[PDB]
Amino acid sequence: MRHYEIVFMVHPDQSEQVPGMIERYTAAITGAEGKIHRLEDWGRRQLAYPINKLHKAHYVLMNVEAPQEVIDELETTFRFNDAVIRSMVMRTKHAVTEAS
Amino acid sequence: SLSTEATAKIVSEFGRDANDTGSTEVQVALLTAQINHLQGHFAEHKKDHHSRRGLLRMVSQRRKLLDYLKRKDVARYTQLIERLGLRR
Amino acid sequence: SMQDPIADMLTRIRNGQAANKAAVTMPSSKLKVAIANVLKEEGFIEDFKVEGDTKPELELTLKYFQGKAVVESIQRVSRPGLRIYKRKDELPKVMAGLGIAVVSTSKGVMTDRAARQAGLGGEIICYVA
Amino acid sequence: EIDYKDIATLKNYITESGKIVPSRITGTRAKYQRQLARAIKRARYLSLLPYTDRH
Amino acid sequence: AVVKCKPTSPGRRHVVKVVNPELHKGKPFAPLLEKNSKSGGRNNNGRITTRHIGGGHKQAYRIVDFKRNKDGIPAVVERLEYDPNRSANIALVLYKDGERRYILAPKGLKAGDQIQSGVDAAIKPGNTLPMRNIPVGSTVHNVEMKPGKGGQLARSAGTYVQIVARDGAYVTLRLRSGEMRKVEADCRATLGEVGNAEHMLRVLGKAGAARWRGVRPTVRGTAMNPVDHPHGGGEGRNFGKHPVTPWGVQTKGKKTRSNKRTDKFIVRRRS
Amino acid sequence: IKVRENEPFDVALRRFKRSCEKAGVLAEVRRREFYEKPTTERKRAKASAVK
RNA sequence: AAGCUUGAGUCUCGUAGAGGGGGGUAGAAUUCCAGGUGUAGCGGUGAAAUGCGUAGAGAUCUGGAGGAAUACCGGUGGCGAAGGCGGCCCCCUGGACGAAGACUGACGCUCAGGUGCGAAAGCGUGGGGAGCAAACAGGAUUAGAUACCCUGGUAGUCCACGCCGUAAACGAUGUCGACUUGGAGGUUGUGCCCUUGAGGCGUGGCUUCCGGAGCUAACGCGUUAAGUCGACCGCCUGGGGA
RNA sequence: ACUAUGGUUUUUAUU
């Protein structure tokens, strides 16, 4: 298998319903026997410009182990649902302890 | 240049051992395996001319060894060309 | 790899004294050792030594005195592309008698003196002064 | 140093102009300065630092 | 792909051939045929109202489903075949329930592919869902301009329509004349771009080819009798006038839109 | 000069005394991309007669 | 004819790259549409017009369409055989370089003829066209304006592909092995000793300007030599005509 | 926002 980070920016005042929206498509990687190590918040951060009308993000980390011929099927599954921008996939070396 | 397994395979399955890398027939097989792995890269990339420049020299290194082997022993040369996919 | 072993021998000697080095080293050959023999036997070098069996290597110990430079001109004349030969009646003079000439003859590497005392001609090995 | 993803930490190393001081006039290590200027590149690509001073 | 022909004759020296090895060879599905009766350019009273047409082979029409819903029903491409009129071929679709129908094949002209319909399908060329369910920048072929209709836009080789703005029950999309139209979001299309994209690279060929295509020669208005075309008369080879149609209307600069009832859909046209 | 200093100034800047021709300032040191290097020299100072 | 093995070739585990190709992707903006707030000017000049407004421009906000290149970071700082390669991903890929081991056994090194690699302009075949822009139009400037000024705008700039073979391809250093001198400012692999030294001896690969020896008519080259010694291939013949 | 048009020829060398 191959490892990826896959981080979602997430609006802090919808951060209790956005992880369930990502889990509306996780069948696209658990169908390939992918293993998901958190799909969870890390901590609020501030931006130098607004993303989805807000200068802040809640940062929700997936941390996944999967085959290599399914990472383009997964990023195409988010091509039109308007939850993925600038990849944020960050391949290889896998997660650090508790993501620090 | 190829992965730890893509070579061995060849060096022990067509040769004798991974500590007998230098045998002439096995170096011609290691070049043939390297050429055929790149026949899965080129004609799928219809250009990539600056990387295709490597494949151009790999067939020249295979020509260097085949011609020198034909002058070194004609029976080993004639055996090799029906044990690899050579001279069509 | 090496296209002229004796051009490297002569460069290692000629420039070694200009680098003021005590000794210089190279892969050893019975041609290099025969050239080192006549250079010691006519008093231009101090010692030559070989070590090894499957990788034989030569070390030449350079000769020094009260003045400056013991070897002042060491010119090959004959090269593997274009060779130069000499005959008994015309065996060469070097720097009007300041130097001597070396030849391979039909017997081995020797002085023009030892050649004219056997009646031999042959290829030039070096002119030394 | 070792991280680029948290701005509450990264902001302690930069000026209020988004810059750093050259290594040989701060006594800092050679690759540490390259990795610091690269952490600033990665933090701009993560939208934690600006592309323009406008607005 | 498209290829040249041997220069061994006139016409053949310029004519282009369309080739594809992944078309099925066999017997066409006759329940989806309309033999298509000809008119020779004549009205219902036997009088000519359209010129330059008559003769050639019958060509006919291949029928597509004008009531295509099939929501939730998976299907497969059973056949990919030649059409005597459609430049972008025709595909036969076989539903899991339970008929054979003709559908307009998108880019890649693929056989043995599995395709869906309805609001749950994944966004792919040839996967059909309402324009209510698609984002801005999306590409569509076989587009209907009123909900539930048999389609009228983007059905020719290399054709498509793009959606550029959206609000509630209506989407705003662009047309090839510099127009931009407001259309109902309940329209479903067939999603993507029409395949082949090379049939516009063509030259007519030999003069007898127009006769098997059913295309008839022109007549110069200055050689016609002076009362049947305003350009007639003669004598001779002098025309001291500004050019007109056979009905005495100037050919240039006369803009003809006179509809008065469809302005409500316009977003880029001007009077 | 490209300065952002605002409020209490008059007479359209050029505020630094002896800034161009016969020194000050810089060009000591005009060649080889080192133009602003004497500012660094006289800040890393320390002594100027070094052995 | 047959050996030997340090140079050559390959293999384990590692170092750093805007090198190449395939399929994706931002920041922001000249332009353009539309809804707020708002009023008679915008742009250029020694003066001005053409153009864009007065029907609401320019302005500034809110939300979009559009094609296409990298600013801040960036440093002659990297890569490629070379004109060239730079915002950021995912997937394939040629080459350079090291530590310790294992095979081949002269395997090196240059190349007649040959077969190959494009920067820009231009072209063949389609697609596209936001800004810019040969040609060209609109107005001035001027003796003229053929140019500078200034608004538009086709060819082009761009893409998947195919031709062309050419340059200031200039780091003007043919290519390749060996032997070397001090500096500034950047960078990367590694062995060894209680670290008698809370620390130090030993060594491989690159990179951009200085400045020695040696080289030259003088400029300059300068360990990535135009230097010392050697191997192979190519080119020139006073000027103009040409 | 700056001006076309005024051709051509010259010396110290000896004691």
UniProtKB/Swiss-Prot annotation, chain B:
InterPro entries in the cross-refs: Ribosomal_uS15, Ribosomal_uS15_bac-type, uS15_NS1_RNA-bd_sf
GO cellular component: cytoplasm; cytosol; cytosolic small ribosomal subunit
Pfam families noted in UniProt: Ribosomal_S15
UniProt keyword Mitochondrion present: no
Keyword Magnesium: no
GO terms, molecular function: rRNA binding; small ribosomal subunit rRNA binding; structural constituent of ribosome
Induction comment from the UniProt entry of this chain: Part of the metY operon that extends to pnp, also has its own promoter.
Keyword terms: Ribonucleoprotein, Ribosomal protein, RNA-binding, rRNA-binding, Translation regulation
Domain of life: Bacteria
A biological-process GO annotation: regulation of translation
Family indicated by similarity: Belongs to the universal ribosomal protein uS15 family.
Task performed by this protein: One of the primary rRNA binding proteins, it binds directly to 16S rRNA where it helps nucleate assembly of the platform of the 30S subunit by binding and bridging several RNA helices of the 16S rRNA. Binds to its own mRNA, stabilizing it 5-UTR and preventing its translation.
Subunit (UniProt): Part of the 30S ribosomal subunit. Forms a bridge to the 50S subunit in the 70S ribosome, contacting the 23S rRNA.
Name the UniProt record assigns to this protein: Small ribosomal subunit protein uS15
UniProtKB/Swiss-Prot annotation, chain D:
GO molecular function terms noted in the UniProt entry: mRNA 5'-UTR binding; small ribosomal subunit rRNA binding; structural constituent of ribosome
Keyword Ribonucleoprotein: yes
Keywords carried by this UniProt record: Acetylation, Ribonucleoprotein, Ribosomal protein, RNA-binding, rRNA-binding
GO CC entries: cytoplasm; cytosol; cytosolic small ribosomal subunit
One of the protein's GO biological processes: translation
Disulfide bonds listed in the record: none
Family: Belongs to the bacterial ribosomal protein bS18 family.
Free-text function comment from the UniProt entry: Binds as a heterodimer with protein bS6 to the central domain of the 16S rRNA, where it helps stabilize the platform of the 30S subunit.
SUBUNIT field: Part of the 30S ribosomal subunit. Forms a tight heterodimer with protein bS6.
Designated name of the protein: Small ribosomal subunit protein bS18
Gene that specifies this protein: rpsR
Curated annotation (Swiss-Prot), chain E:
Keywords: Acetylation, Ribonucleoprotein, Ribosomal protein, RNA-binding, rRNA-binding
GO molecular function ontology, one term from the record: zinc ion binding
This protein's GO CC annotations: cytoplasm; cytosol; cytosolic large ribosomal subunit; DnaA-L2 complex
InterPro entries in alphabetical order: NA-bd_OB-fold (IPR012340), Rib_uL2_dom2 (IPR014722), Ribosomal_uL2 (IPR002171), Ribosomal_uL2_bac/org-type (IPR005880), Ribosomal_uL2_C (IPR022669), Ribosomal_uL2_CS (IPR022671), Ribosomal_uL2_dom3 (IPR014726), Ribosomal_uL2_RNA-bd_dom (IPR022666)
PROSITE patterns for this protein: RIBOSOMAL_L2
Region (Disordered), start-end ranges: 27-52, 220-271
N6-acetyllysine modifications at: 241
Note: This protein can be partially replaced in vivo by its H.marismortui (HmaL2) or human (L8, from the 60S cytoplasmic ribosome) homolog.
Record protein name field: Large ribosomal subunit protein uL2
Native source species: Escherichia coli (strain K12)
Gene transcribed to yield this protein: rplB
Curated annotation (Swiss-Prot), chain F:
Domain of life: Bacteria
Disulfide pairings: none
Keywords tagged on the record: Ribonucleoprotein, Ribosomal protein, RNA-binding, rRNA-binding
Cellular component terms (Gene Ontology): cytoplasm; cytosol; cytosolic small ribosomal subunit
Biased composition regions of type Basic residues, renumbered to the chain: 43-51
One function term, GO molecular function aspect: structural constituent of ribosome
BP GO terms, sorted: cytoplasmic translation; ribosomal small subunit assembly
Keyword set includes Nucleus: no
Quaternary state and interactors: Part of the 30S ribosomal subunit. In stalled ribosomes contacts ribosome rescue factor SmrB.
Family statement: Belongs to the bacterial ribosomal protein bS21 family.
Function per UniProt: Probbly involved in recognition of ribosome rescue factor SmrB in stalled/collided disomes; fusion of protein fragments to its N-terminus decreases ribosome rescue in the presence of SmrB.
Protein name according to UniProt: Small ribosomal subunit protein bS21
Annotated source species: Escherichia coli (strain K12)
From-to range in the entire protein, with total length: 4 to 54 of 71
